[PDB]
């Protein structure tokens, strides 16, 4: 049993705890703006990779 310090969540694997803390800087509005930026640019076919017409 392994419990993280933010959010008090408990897991059973230390690697799971490390990925959890990695999922867990600056102002809240700046994080708002970078989240809306990456969500605006997340699925465009510029970053995205992978009978007619004579």
């Amino acid at each position: 049993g392994y419990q993280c310090h933010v959010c008090s969540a408990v897991l059973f694997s230390p690697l799971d705890l490390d990925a959890h803390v990695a999922s867990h800087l600056t102002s809240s509005e700046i994080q708002r703006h970078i989240t809306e930026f990456i969500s605006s640019w997340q699925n465009h076919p510029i970053v995205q990779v992978s009978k007619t017409a004579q």
């Binding site: 800087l25 600056t26 102002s27 809240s28 509005e29």
Partner: protein, 106 residues
């Protein structure tokens, strides 16, 4: 008086009535104002955190932070230890905005 009330910074106990807080009856044997205005505090000994921040307008939150820190410092048994602010998870803007949304109603 309505012109005065705006710019004057009120006492800590004033802003209890905003949030409908009250000093309970058991505390008046003890000296409370001491541990309000001297010991429960912000800017903890770790330092500043950018989540432990308060916007320049609406510094009425400081009283309520003193109240809640005092309650947490004293309800436990043992010496009334000084208490420091671990972060508030939303920022003072979003937190006080939630209090605004509560006071939108009565």
């Amino acid at each position: 008086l309505a012109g005065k009330i705006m710019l004057q910074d009120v006492n800590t106990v004033q802003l209890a009535r905003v949030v409908n807080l009250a000093v309970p009856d058991t505390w008046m044997s003890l000296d409370f104002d001491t541990m309000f205005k001297h010991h429960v505090k912000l800017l903890p000994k770790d330092g500043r955190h950018l989540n432990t921040d308060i916007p320049p307008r609406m510094g009425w939150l400081r009283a309520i932070l003193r109240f809640l820190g005092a309650g947490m410092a004293m309800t436990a048994t043992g010496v009334a230890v000084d208490i420091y602010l671990e972060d508030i998870h939303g920022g003072g803007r979003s937190l006080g905005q939630r209090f605004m949304t509560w006071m939108r109603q009565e």
